[PDB]
Amino acid sequence: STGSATTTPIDSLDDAYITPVQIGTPAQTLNLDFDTGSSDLWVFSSETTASEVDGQTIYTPSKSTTAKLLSGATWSISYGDGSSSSGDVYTDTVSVGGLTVTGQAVESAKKVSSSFTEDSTIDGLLGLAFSTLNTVSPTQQKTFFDNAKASLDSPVFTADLGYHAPGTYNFGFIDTTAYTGSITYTAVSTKQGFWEWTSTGYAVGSGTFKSTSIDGIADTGTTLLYLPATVVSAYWAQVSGAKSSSSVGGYVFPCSATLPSFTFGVGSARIVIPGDYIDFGPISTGSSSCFGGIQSSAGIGINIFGDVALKAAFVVFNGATTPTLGFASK
């Protein structure tokens, strides 16, 4: 089997991407944020505190003939931006782009933090990291990808995120028309439950490439590119007037600037992020100070290849017995 679904930026900055997902019988279509940095599939639901729902589409398990309460199971998650959600769990049929999993754990939110309520465009998350991070208790649950893997033609999914445009998540096959050149594959460590890999270095604009190992995660659920402070300083030093602002919470730059590209290494290959991908626009409406798309990871404890980086590539998440990641230009 295979699946193929279009993923769409939620706003004009590509702050996140939503992909439609069919849950239950008859189908209830919810727009989920596919997140390779987490491992819970959770949704706004008929159980969500009513004051915490503001325009999202909800899953109502009582209207699904295939929903079954997973008795006793609860879940609770916190994300690196401080947001969180929690609730109970049902199993139900879940389809993505024509690929169906029966008995998928669908984690129904009873509570969501303010950031979720305030984002009417995201109806939930679909976790695609390793199942060892799944928060369900007392019996940890598998991700949609783990449940589907055995049926898939090839035990892979691919992320092809667009810049200010739709893109695609595919399951079970590699679309050889979707990228240029070859795919370079690199080793993955699952020890922290993430798609954790080691970049071979970086370049700023037309500058010389610096060979240096940068350990970090491929995280579709994170907007920006978070890298060591030395790297980020070198990038922003090339932008006249850029500075790190404690009041804003990162690097800002004059909106009048033209940003340089940023290249990261994947083995001997190179992925170039165009400068325009690094512009996240005015810090507040009407400001001429713009927010940078490359920020320091020093506060986080891990480097994160988020959407800014991933949208410059066609990315293979290879869930073979020994997982690997593949990157190609496109």
Ligand X SMILES: O=C(c1ccc(-c2ccco2)nc1O)N(Cc1ccccn1)C1CC1
Q: Catalogue the active-site residues.
A: 35, 199
Draw the binding track, 24-53, toward ligand X (x: CB under 6 A; -: no contact): -------------xx---------------
Q: Reduce the DSSP state of residue 119 to 3 states and report it.
A: coil
Burial of residue 191 (number of CB atoms within 10 Å: 0-12, 13-18, 19+): exposed
- Cα 191 to chain center, whole Å? 19
Residue whose C-alpha is closest to residue 33's, from 193, 167, 221, 312: 221
At closest approach, how far in Å is the CB of 113 from ligand X? 12
Burial of residue 139 (number of CB atoms within 10 Å: 0-12, 13-18, 19+): exposed
Site for ligand X in 95-134 (CB under 6 A): 133
CB 46 within 8 A of CB 62: yes
At closest approach, how far in Å is the CB of 306 from ligand X? 7
Separation CA 196–CA 194 (nearest Å): 5
Q: Which residue is nearest to ligand X (CB)?
A: 80
Tell me which of 1, 80, 100, 272 binds ligand X, using CB under 6 A. Answer: 80
Tell me which of 77, 112, 122, 309 binds ligand X, using CB under 6 A. Answer: 77
- Using the structure block, give the residue that is written with the tokens 């209830």: 28
CB 230 within 8 A of CB 210: no
By CB under 6 A, how many residues form the interface with ligand X?
15
Site for ligand X in 287-306 (CB under 6 A): 300, 302, 304
Q: Is 93 in the site for ligand X (CB under 6 A)?
A: no
- Considering beta carbons, is residue 102 or 245 the nearer one to ligand X? 245
Q: Is 135 in the site for ligand X (CB under 6 A)?
A: yes
Interface with ligand X by CB under 6 A: which residues?
Answer: 37-38, 77-81, 133, 135, 219, 221-222, 300, 302, 304
